[PDB]
Each structure stands twice: as structure tokens, then as C-alpha cells.
Design an enzyme around this catalytic site. Sequence first.
Site, PDB file in Angstrom:
ATOM      1  N   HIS A   1      -5.477  44.389 -14.451  1.00  0.00           N
ATOM      2  CA  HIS A   1      -6.788  44.228 -13.828  1.00  0.00           C
ATOM      3  C   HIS A   1      -7.790  43.312 -14.383  1.00  0.00           C
ATOM      4  O   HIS A   1      -8.793  43.135 -13.885  1.00  0.00           O
ATOM      5  CB  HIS A   1      -7.494  45.665 -13.100  1.00  0.00           C
ATOM      6  CG  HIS A   1      -6.511  46.676 -12.769  1.00  0.00           C
ATOM      7  ND1 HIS A   1      -6.158  46.840 -11.253  1.00  0.00           N
ATOM      8  CD2 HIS A   1      -5.861  47.424 -13.280  1.00  0.00           C
ATOM      9  CE1 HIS A   1      -5.248  47.516 -11.261  1.00  0.00           C
ATOM     10  NE2 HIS A   1      -4.890  48.040 -12.356  1.00  0.00           N
TER      11      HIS A   1
ATOM     12  N   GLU B   1      -3.622  22.265 -15.946  1.00  0.00           N
ATOM     13  CA  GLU B   1      -3.935  21.905 -14.861  1.00  0.00           C
ATOM     14  C   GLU B   1      -2.920  20.867 -13.936  1.00  0.00           C
ATOM     15  O   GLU B   1      -2.714  21.268 -12.767  1.00  0.00           O
ATOM     16  CB  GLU B   1      -5.345  21.252 -15.066  1.00  0.00           C
ATOM     17  CG  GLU B   1      -6.250  22.055 -15.473  1.00  0.00           C
ATOM     18  CD  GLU B   1      -7.676  21.271 -16.182  1.00  0.00           C
ATOM     19  OE1 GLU B   1      -7.594  20.111 -16.258  1.00  0.00           O
ATOM     20  OE2 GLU B   1      -8.607  21.903 -16.740  1.00  0.00           O
TER      21      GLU B   1
END
Lengths: 462, 462, 462, 462
Positions: free
Chosen positions: B187, B330
Amino acid sequence: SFRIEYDTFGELKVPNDKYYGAQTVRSTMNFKIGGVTERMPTPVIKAFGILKRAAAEVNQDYGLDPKIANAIMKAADEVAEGKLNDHFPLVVWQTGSGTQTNMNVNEVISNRAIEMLGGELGSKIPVHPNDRVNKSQSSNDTFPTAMHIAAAIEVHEVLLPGLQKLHDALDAKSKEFAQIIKIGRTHTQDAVPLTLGQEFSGYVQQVKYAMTRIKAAMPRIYELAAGGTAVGTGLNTRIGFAEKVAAKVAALTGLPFVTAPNKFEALAAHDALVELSGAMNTTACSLMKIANDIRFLGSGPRSGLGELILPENEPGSSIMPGKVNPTQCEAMTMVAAQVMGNHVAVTVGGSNGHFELNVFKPMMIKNVLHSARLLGDASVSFTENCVVGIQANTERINKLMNESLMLVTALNPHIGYDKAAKIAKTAHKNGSTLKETAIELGYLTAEQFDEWVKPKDMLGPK
Amino acid sequence: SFRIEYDTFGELKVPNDKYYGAQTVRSTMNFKIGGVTERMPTPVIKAFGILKRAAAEVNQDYGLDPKIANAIMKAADEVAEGKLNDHFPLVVWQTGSGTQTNMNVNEVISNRAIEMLGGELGSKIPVHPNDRVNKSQSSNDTFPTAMHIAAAIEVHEVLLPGLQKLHDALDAKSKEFAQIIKIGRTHTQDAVPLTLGQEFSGYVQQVKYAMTRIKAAMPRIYELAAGGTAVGTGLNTRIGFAEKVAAKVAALTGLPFVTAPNKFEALAAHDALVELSGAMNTTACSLMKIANDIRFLGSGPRSGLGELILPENEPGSSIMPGKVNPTQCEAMTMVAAQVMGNHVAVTVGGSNGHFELNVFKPMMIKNVLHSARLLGDASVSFTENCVVGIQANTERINKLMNESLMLVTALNPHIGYDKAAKIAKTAHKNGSTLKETAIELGYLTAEQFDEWVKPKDMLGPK
Amino acid sequence: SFRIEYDTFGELKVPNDKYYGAQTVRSTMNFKIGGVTERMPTPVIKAFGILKRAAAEVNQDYGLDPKIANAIMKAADEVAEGKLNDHFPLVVWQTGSGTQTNMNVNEVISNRAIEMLGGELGSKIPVHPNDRVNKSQSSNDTFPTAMHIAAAIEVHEVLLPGLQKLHDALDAKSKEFAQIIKIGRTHTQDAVPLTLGQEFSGYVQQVKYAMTRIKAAMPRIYELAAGGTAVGTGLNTRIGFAEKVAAKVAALTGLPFVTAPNKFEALAAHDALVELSGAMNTTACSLMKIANDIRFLGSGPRSGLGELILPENEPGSSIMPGKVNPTQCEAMTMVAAQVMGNHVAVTVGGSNGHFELNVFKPMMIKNVLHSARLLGDASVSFTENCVVGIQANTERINKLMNESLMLVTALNPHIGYDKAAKIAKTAHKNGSTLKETAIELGYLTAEQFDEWVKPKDMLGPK
Amino acid sequence: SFRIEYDTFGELKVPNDKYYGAQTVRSTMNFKIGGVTERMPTPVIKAFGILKRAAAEVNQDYGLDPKIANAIMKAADEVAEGKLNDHFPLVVWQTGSGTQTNMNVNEVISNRAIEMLGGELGSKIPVHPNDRVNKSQSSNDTFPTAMHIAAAIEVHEVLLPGLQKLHDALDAKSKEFAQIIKIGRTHTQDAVPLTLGQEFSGYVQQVKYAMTRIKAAMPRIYELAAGGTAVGTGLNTRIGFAEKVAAKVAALTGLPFVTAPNKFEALAAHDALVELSGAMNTTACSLMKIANDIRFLGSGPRSGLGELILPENEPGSSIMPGKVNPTQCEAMTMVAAQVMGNHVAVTVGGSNGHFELNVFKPMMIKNVLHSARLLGDASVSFTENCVVGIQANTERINKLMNESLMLVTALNPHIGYDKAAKIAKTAHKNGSTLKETAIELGYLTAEQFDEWVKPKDMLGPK
């Protein structure tokens, strides 16, 4: 426990406590696809109630006995008010015109109006399902009308109110964080400062813009197909019926419904639903970014970013102080992904009309309403169970501002670029702060550093 | 400048330096959609060269003169070797059967063979484009055969080799990092420890499974449509031609092509391209996770996670030590997003066949080849320019381990739950380590902490 | 009517007729997203029953009292058997690890096992929800295990049996139509002949191949994450627990479940669900084509194609003989579009794992199960309410074969190409048949035409 | 051949005939992903030329020497006019901020201006790429500004003009076909009549609504990021530069660009590109319907629908009169499918921003420009090569009207329901017309049928 009705395929038992009839029973047998989670959405059923009440009232101008019309109107109102939801068992995965649900609606309204008038259930007397409740209508132009009524009401009552609450809570958190300076991140690398308030103002603008995009999709949703009848010509309908039904729906709802200027475009395609789904798809992109950012900004307590303290939603453990799972972030980003998938399903259906009728209608409206409710409900939940409770971890933010290499550029007008880089390079090598390093090399004093390096002067143009 | 050729609609100027003819010029006039970036992918052109070479050799069994066949074969070889790429100006956005590109190929091969035979370009003497280069073939079964040949070669030569390099580089790093313990994240909250080697081993398994998934999609790609002719029946081709040309393609390529056992399925649908795109779609999800994780693990230098030091391939700023943008992450995550969209394009096309022929063929193979090439090229680039040079920031990792609140449970057997919690709670409030706080509270000695709290012992089941 | 329980946020009323507890009640308050159609799918709840029964039995090897284990096993069996579905009110849109549903399952199994043992509801005595029912487990590795159990059972029991029925019915209709010659269509233009049996054999192959693709996605679904615990290390679990739980689930289900070889890959990603969704996405493309073809081939009665007579599903009208809406075609193509959208939602979630845990799990399994059930159920319905009742319109097919211009090519070996084209051109101009025209021009006799033009000789290579 | 330039990593060979420099060569070495079809779209390059021209003119207010500014402006003009396209070799798959293309632009403009000033290429004297061509700008706010400039220009010059031509051509056909009555189709079954003009008017309305939807997406595209610099604060740019460069861009282009009111939203997200892609996605659904309808309406010549005769642009076969493949419909529906996939690529990228910067920028603008260009070009091609030349097959249409069973309801007032049904049922069984059967049954006279059954009277409400 049951009465007996008939269709052209055989005898059918209808439960006596049910207001639907043989056509609806046959349909539950012919479309056993997906189970009860696949039932036609209640907003569609209620929208049909609004529509059958408007048509009954308008049909008095065209020879509908007022006593029969009044019973139909009262029964349609009960459908529209959600009092008869248990009498609609059909799934989305029926005919692509929604014919089975139109008949379900005609049957239920007829039997309930029959009951109001004293007749016997299943008899069609004195309110015939097709001849009276479906008077001057077709399955082809009524289901599209119910779709747009349901979509507009859901946008007005669930989707936009949820986004508005989220916008306002993020705006409050933005003004509350307006003076908390933190390190920016580009490419996830350390970058020049901005305030948490500035970063949150970006989220606020995204939600404001999402609301505007959704509103920009509504004028075509307000166009209603009623009066197009079977292929868009209006054959077997009366002149003025289309304008009158639309004007009646607008008065009943308080929303600016109008008749569709071109009924062929309104029956053969549902481009307005594709476009509204597109606006929800953009909204989902915006909410994915906002929620994922808040998720990461709350990561920690010690091995994450740790800028935000999110409110607890799960039972915290005494052994685990400061650990808080970003529960609402996860529900919201899962919803955002669902909306993106729903949008592709809407697109595929919207692209596949044939000639006079697009026959993907139930699946398209199911996905639009599903995205609209998920986005509105999650927006409320995210607001109340996460955003309003967010706190800044100012001690950690302040500690990391002092440890950052990013502020070294405030020293260049005072000791020159070359000496600034040597400070940054040396602190990066030694793991020290810029201040410790700038002094240990004799380049300046602590008093000079504290006066030259003021992050509050690095938040705007000059 | 130009020569003049004729079709049944008039006269066409053909550049003298081009090997294509009238039909191709006509095609460029009718399909000006998108510009040069939309040209039919070179892998399809080369695959057409392989196919025409195979057909010409096999067609000697069915009357083709060996001296004509030999010049066709030699010209088709030049197409397949990428020597005539400038003679194919047509875009993807042509007829949905790819007929224009089939004619483009027939003309180029006809004219180049005529040139080798000493004839005049445009003459059709002695190599007629349709009667000899398209002998025994149809418009409808040639392009799908070329699609599958091109996809198989691109999977074999570009996509799987790129994934293999990425798998091997991630596995080497996994072994290199096998002893470096860090704090886990669930999480995005701090969690129990694992090694960088364990975390990277998850990535390795994902890439291994990607390669298996892609390989699982190839058996249906190896089925070739050649011999189905117009509608799948094989009308107007010779018995045994289907099997012989598939075997000749197999021998020319070294890949296990066979004739499709049902030619109606092979012409009416491209489900195998949809399934191969779906395997690449799963691969994209895997690569997205791997690259985004490495992106965030390398974030910093001081306000991020800081576990990894990524290679700096483009020069930075001297005033900014430690700031390295994860530029290969990226490129890779953008590629992953593109594959997901391409997959939806493939799906829509694949869902829309009509009767005997799917006529979305050029766009489906374009997206499949585009995805395969991006995934393969980005995997090589991500490997060589990022993965192989990744270093662990062991000094920062070791400090974060010592500052974590997660390890406090190793003290439960030794001082009980209630005292450990008070240490965790007090360290959390004071901003000190677990060890400092347990000592300052007098619950144990430094030597007792160092012997009880051993992260090496927290990495497996007991 | 209610008992009182507590969590760390306050007092909560729990209905006395409900086996869940305070954690589940709190969750219905914290995750009010989407209403009852959003409830966690019952196949997940049942899979949890299978899993908690296997874990309880295995945990006897690790100190679980057999009396307590036996009550847990019996209670878990009732969950797995669908006897306790009403005690699971939580929606998909919860935490992305499915924690709330894991606790719902632990609470219900505990209270029902407490009841079996004579204790009082809500007491945790003698079966503590976490300490006993969740023993040796984490929410992080149990929800993934339940996902894969549910997915495999649904594929085995719903999806493949539905596709098998469709395959067999299409294969029967293919052999029944093997001698009915019709005009092929390419680009939707008239083309050379093929039999309805040949065209239907293409559909059969697509469904056969769909089943194979789905089966090829199952080996990774059979890998179970149980034993990975919080971050994949297996910390706080016993050696051999992972292998034993998986072997127990396999014996309970009769399916070849195994433990995942790499638990980091199994917790941080759900690439196997993305790939299974991909196989369903290909299946949806195949079914879109089959159903849309059957839709169009049944169009008419007079202004369409009219090759097939579909069975009536809606009440036919006496005024409208021969009009039959292709109802099941519409439900099936709407389902196919939904699967394509669901696949994008699965892809987005599958692409967005973070570090040790992907937290999109509930939405991903919801979409996989939704596609699996929709495809299986629609396959059955399409089979029973459309495919098995399809009849060929042989009179119309035969009439259109005689009126087609396509068979003119059987005359070329007898009167030459040039005279054949003049027949076709003249018949096309006059609106006459090839036979009438070929005779009216004196090119041949009726006896010559009937002998030279034999469509049964135009269905294969020569 | 080559010259030698240097960056801080070493020596680089730069072709003497190229205006780019060391940084661009370095970029081509590090991002070899996909080949020449992946080059950054020329509209982005030209938009960069416009932006650099605007910045240089404005930067005279902030110290830039007018003779240097003038040469920069003249070189930037050549970039914007498409005169230097060969000096940009970088692909889309680069850094997610587009920094490499920004540097490519700075170098090309610097070197071309140095050439105009009589200097030596590679010298940086007297036009420094970053200190003068990138003056007052950042890596992070230039590329998003260029994205919005390129998208606005492409919408204005390519996409909307193409849709306008298609709208106008469909409207002319609608008026040309205003009196041609044909049989409608709902569910692809025969339905009540409408004119071809009415059906085409639906298409016209769809294209009109597409143009309105695209225009509705432009206001947020006109907001420019220039002036946000690194993270949105405007640090290191001058007060008023944001507003001045937006106004200069507006005056250079004639489009209403303004500065974005929230620069954090403008850098951290590209929601406006997602919304514009969504408007194009709706357009694709509309065009898919229009082109697929026209595809099927032109099917035949004898085994299809046969209502339309489409222009034959590529020569056919003399043996095949009337066979015309709807090749422009295929190009257009393939383009529509591609836009839908591109839209999902845009969505995934747009959903994945991180903190202050979305780093999916090159792939998002590539897909938006690709969709816009395909839609615009295909609309022009579909218009000129198909729509403008469509003819109605009035002879076949008139015959199908006479053979329809649909008109039989005009006989209800004149011979009652029960007799009409017997006519419909008997015509359906015999294969005769309604008129032949009503006469052969002696229910009316020929002159009575011709006066009672008037399709002209069945086209509207009464």
C-alpha cells in the site's frame, strides 16, 4: 400463489404478488445471462416511470380517456418513485433495443393501474399494456428516452454533487496548506520548492475542470428521442406529441429536456452517451492522478515520502504507530480504472449502430450509469474518509527542506555558481546539509546562510 | 523524370526511377491518408517478398517457365532483403484487404525482374504482374499470409530477443543484490523486510512469464492463409499449392509455418493477431510495473526513496549532484501505454469481420508490428542504458533499515509485546531509532538489541 | 434484534441474525460505493471458503487444536457451499488488497464455528477471527489465492462448458448445411460460392480456438500465492505451509493448483488475470463476428440477405409474417463489447502494481469473473435460443444463386472470356439472369448452360 | 562528413550538413526505439518554432540583444515553416518531458542563427542554445506549450476542415435523395419506410455534432504552460513573461491562446489532451456508423442490399460488372478503430502523472495528432472519392418497395386487419407481392391498391 397467463409460446405462471406479466416471465427464461448483479439499473426503471407518466398525460390530447390516463399516471409515479423496484427482474443482456424492459414497464404499470381501478391482475382490462400504456410509442424511441432521462438525473443528483464536495474539500485543504513549503518532484527527482497549498490547488483545478467537461456533455443528453417511433419518421404518432412529451418530462424533472432535432440521429446512434462517458473518462484520469499522489505523499512512516498523515480507516495496531493504509485512495483508483474500461465498452457499442437503430442500448446506458454512480459515490467517500482528515507532517517536511540539495541556487548571487556547486557536491558526497558544508569550507557564516537561503522567496517569478 | 503507363481509367505518370507501376500510382492518388509515417510497415513488405519468392518457386510445378521464375525469385529476394523499400509509397489506410500493397508488390517485382531480363520498365514483357508474379494467388489470401510471416519474424528477431536481454540483466542484478536487505512496501506503507534480490526476482519471473505468453500465441500465427483464394474454398488455385507454399516459406525462414487447416476462419478473422496483441498487452502491464518501480526506487537524491542509483547517460547540471532523471523508465512506460492502446485498435478491427473476409487487415498488422517493435527496442534500451548499470545505495539503505519502526517485533519474545510497543510509540513520537529509544528507556542494552534484532533472520518462513 | 460490538473507532450494532462482526459493519459504512450490484462476487466468497478450510486443516500440523480446526472446517464448508451468501455485504470498491473481505470471511467463519461449538456470537471465544481463522495467513496472500481459485472454477464450470455447447451446436448446423451452396461475400460484395456448411465451419474453428486460448491461460491461474504472507517472503508462516495449502486446495477442488514458484511475482502483480482476460477478449472478437454474421444473414424477410430463418424469441405479429428480430445475436454482441471494456479495466489495474503489492485486486477479479460468466451464460443462451433452431432459406438461396452474376466464369473454357463478359455486362444492364442473357444472344443453349455452369464444381481447388 | 562537438561525457560526431548538435547526437544514441516512423511529429516541431520565435521577441523586454533576437526569430521561423524538418531525428520514445526535443530545437535554431550571423556551426558563438534560445524557459513548460499549439493548429487546419467537407457532402446527398423512399431496417429486419434523404440527414447531424464536440474541447487546449518553469511556480522566469508569450503566440497564429490560470494543473496533467482525444473518440464512433452503413447499403450487386451505387475509383474486372468494393469505407472504418485505440493510449498516459510533472507527454501528443490527422485526411478522402459520387439505385429501390411486405398496413382501414394479414401471410408463403396476392384473393382491385398504398404518406406523424 401464482396466476396463469399465456404468450404465443405457451402457458406461464406469474406470481400473484408480482405486477409484471407473461412477457416479462418469458424474458427471464430467454435471457438468463449473468445473474442478479446484471439487472437493468434502477435509474432506467425510474426514468421509464417519468416517461410513461408524461406520455399518458399528453395522450389525453389524442383520445386517451382521462380516467384511464389518471390511473396510468398514478401507477407510473409509483414506478418513478422507486416503490415498485421488485417488479423488474430483467437483465441488461436482453434485446439491444431494450424492448423487454419497455414491456416489463408497460405490464407493471398496466396491472398496477388495473388494480387501482378495481380490475383483476393479468387481464389487460381496463388498461391494455400496449394499447394504453405504450400508446403512441415504440420500444425504439422510449428506451433511448429513458436512457437520457436516467443519465441526466444521475449526473445532476449523484455525479456532480460528489465532485463538488471533493472540489470544496481539496480547496479547503489547499488554503490550510498555503504556507507549508515542500520540495517539488519532477520525474520523481527532487526539484525546486512549492507549497503543499500550490500542489493541492492543481488537484482543485482538475476537479473544477472535470465538472465543466461533464456539464459540457449534457446539452446532447437533454435531447429526447420520444416521437421518433420505429425508424425516426414519427409514423403512427401524432403531430406535436414529440415536443409535448419532452416539455412534460422537463416540467416533471426540473431539467431542460427538449425533443431531439433529428430523430434518425437519436435512434441510430448514442453519440451523446459516448461523449458523456468520454467526459467521465477524463475525470477518471484526473482522479487517478490526485488519489495516487495522495497515496504516495502519505507513504511511510519512515521509508516513504511522509509529507501527509492520512486519517485511519482500518484498525491501527499498537505495535505499528504511524502506519496508515491509504484505503480510500485504493477504492478511488480502482474506480478510475473501471471507468476507463466502461468507456471502451460504451465506445464499442456506440460505434456499432446499424441503419435506423443502434441495438447496443442497454449495455451503453448500464456502463454510463455505472461510471456515473461509482465516480460520485467514490468522490463523496474519498472526501469524508480521507481528504477532510488529511494533516501535513510539517516536522518531516521542515526537516527535509533543511536536508535538500535543491536550495543551493540561492547562494549564486552571493558566492558565485562555482562555489555553490562545490558545496552541493561536497554535501552530496559527505551526506551533510548545505549549511554545514557551506560553513565547514569557510565560504560563508551561519548568519549569512540563514539570510541568503529563504525558500519563501523561491515560490514565484521575479 | 517520368514514364507513362495506362490503366483502364486513363494515363498515369510513373517516376522513371521507381519500380512500381500504374496501379500503385492510382493507389497513391486515392489514399492520401496520414503521410509518410503511415507507410505500410517494412516487415510486411519483406514478408511479401518471401511469399512471392516461395510462390514463384512452387509455381514451376504448375507451368511457370524456369527462366521467368528465376528472375521473379531474384527480384522477390531483393524485396525480402529490404533492398527495394523506397518503391512502396502506399499507406496502411488503404483497402481493408491490403490489395493495393499486393499490387504494389506485384508491380515492383515484375518491373525489377523485367529489368534483370533486359526489358523496358512498365512493359509487362516478359513478367506480367498478375499472371506470373500473382500466379495461383488471390488478393484476399496473400495479405493475411504476409501478415503472419511478418509477425512471426518480428516476434522471433526483435521482440523475444529484447525480452531475453531484459530477463538476463534483471536476473544478474537479482543475484548481485541477493544480500541487500531493505524495507518492503505494501500500500506504499513500510512493511516487513525483503532483499533487493528478492524484489528483482519478481521482475525476472514477470519477464520470463511474458516470453512464455508470447510464445504461446505463435502456433496460430504459424497457420497461413495462402491457398484460401477469394473466399476460402481454394477455387482457382491448384491442389497441393497451399501445403507446398507454406512448406517453402518454412524452409526459407526456419520457422514452423503450416497451411491453415480452416481457410474460412483464416480469411474471415484475425483472431491470432488479437491473441498475440493480448500477450503483448500482458507484457506491457509487466514492463509498466517493473519500470515504474525502478523509477520510484531511484527517486531522490534526498526527498525520495533513494534505494537505487541509476546510470546517468545524458549530462546533468554541476550544481545538481545526485539528481538523475530515470529517462529510460519514462521511454519504457510510455511504450507500455502505447501497447495497451494498440491492443484496443487490434481488438476493434478483429471484432469487425464481415462474412468471408475481415477487411481491417492493414491496421491490425500495423498495430501488432508496432507493439512488437516498441517492446523489443525499449527492452534492449532499458537493459543497456539502465538495468545493467543500476547500483544499490547500500549506505542509505542501511541507514533506513536502522531508522525503520518495522523491526520492533523481534523484541517481542525478549521483553514482551507491551514494552516493544512503548518503544515503537516513543521512537515514532521522538523521531529516534528503535535502538536509541529502547536504550534510553532502559529496556535492554545496546549489545542486547544487536543480538535480538537481526534482519537476516526475517526473510523467510521458519 | 442486534448485539453490540466495538472497534477502535466506536460502538457498532451488529444484527443478531448475521454472522459477520464489527469490522464488516464498519466497512459497509466506510465503503458506500455503488450499491448492491457492486457486492463482491459470490465465486470469490466461495473460494475463500475453500481456502479457509484448507488452511485450517493444514494448520493442525502447526499447533491448531483439532476440535477448533474441525469447527472452522465445517463453517468454511458452509461458506464454500453457498449457504452463507447473505452474510457478505461488502462491495468490490474497498481496499485494493481485499482486506475487508478477508476479515468478513474470518468473522463469519469464526461466529458460525463458535455457534457450532456452543459459544456466544460476537465473542471471539473460542474461535478468534484473526488468531484462528486467519492463522498463518495475511490479507496480502489470501485474497490473491481466492481470486485464482474463483477464476479457475468459473472457467472450468461456466465459461468452457458454455463455449463447448456453442461449438457443438455450430458444428451440427455446419454438417446440416454442408450441401447448401450460396454466394460468398467479400467487402460485402458478391463473390464466388461456398456452402453454408463451409461458412459455419469457420465459426466452429473460431470457438474451438477460443477454448484452446482460454485453456492456455490457465497454468498461471493455477499458481497460488498462499504462503507469501505480507511481502512475499513467507515471514510469520511455517515451512511447507505454502505447498501443503496448495495441495489441499487441489484435492478439495479436483483442479491442479500448485504454489506459485515466485511469491513476489504473485503478490506484486496479477499478470495471469490480465492474460486470462486477454484470452476472453479474443473470444469476444470471435463471438462478435459469429453473432453479427448470423444477425445479418437472417436479415429480411425481403429487404435483407435472407439466407437464414432464425427462431422466434419475441412474440411475432400476424400482420408481420417472416419478421424475426435476432434477439440472441444482440445480447451476445452486447456481451462481447462488455468483455472488451472489462479487459481494459483489468489491464489498467494490472499495470499499476506498486513494489511488493498490487492493490487493484478486487476490481481485477470482478472484471475477470464478470467476463467469464457473461461469456459462458450468453454462449448457452445463444445456443439454445438461436443456433439450434436456425434453418436455411433454401428457396431464397437457390433463387439468388440463379440470379447471381458471379458464376459467369464457368463459361470461359467453353465460349471464351470475351463472350462471357458480354453476357455478364448485358445481364447486369438488363436485369436478367446469365442463362436468359447467354441464350438471347445465341452464345449457347439452355442445355449447354445447365451442363457447363455447375456451382458444385466451384467449391475447391483443382 | 562530420564535425566534432563535445558534451561533458565526451566527443560526438555531428554530420556537417545537420544543424543539430552534441545533445541531439547523444539523444539519438540513448533512444533507439522504433525507427523513423517514430520520429517526433512535425506539428510539434513547427509548434516549437512558433514558441521559440515568440519567446525571442518577448525576451527583448528582458535584456536579449535585438540583433541576436532577430537571427533567432528568423531561424525559428524556418523551423515553424517546415523548412528544417530533416534536422530533427529524435523519436517519441524519449524522456517523458520531451527535453531531448526541446534541446534538439534549441541547437537547430542556435546553429542556423549562427550560420545567418556568419559564424561556425557547433560554435555556440554568438547564439548559445540554452542561454539565448531557451532564455526564460524550462525543459518542463516548453514541451507542453508546444503540444497545445500543435494540437490547436491541427484541429483548426486539418481535422475540422475535413469534417466540414464531409458534413457538406452528406448534406448535399441528403437533399439530392430527399424524395427516394426505401424500406427501413431495425435489428436489420425490414421496417416502415423512410427516405434516403432522411437516413443521410442522420449522418449529417452526427458530423455536425462531432464538430461541436471537438470545438468544445479546445478552450482548455488554448491554455499554455509557458511560464510555469520547473514545477509550476514560475521560479527563474520574469513577471509578465507568461502572459506576454501566450499573447505573442495568439498573434502569430490567430488562435485564442492564453496563459494557463493554474500552472500546477498544466504541468502535472494533460487532461485537456485526454478530453480532446475523447471528442475524437466520439467522432470515430460516428464515422464508423456512417461508413459501415454506406458500406452495406452499397453491397451487391445482386446478393446484398443494393440501394447505393458507389463510385469506382480503382479499375475492376470486365467479367464483373456491378462489383465495386467500398474501399473508402474500409479506409475510414480502419481509421475509426485506430482512433479508439489511440484514445486508450492517451488515457493511460494521462492517468499516470506523478507529483509536479506528467512525464508521458510525447506519447500523449503523438496519439492526439495521429488521430486528428487520420480523421481529417480520411474525411476528405471519403468525401471526394466516395460520398460526392454516390448514386441511388432507384430502379432496384423501387422494385424492393413493391416486393416489401411492410406496406400491408395501409390496407387496414379499407379491408380490415384480418384480410391484410391473410394477404401478407399468403404473399410471404408464395413469394409474390402484396398487390398480386390481394388481387388473386379478390380482396380489392389493382386501382384500389394503387390508391390505398401510398408510401409518400408513410413518412411522418399525422
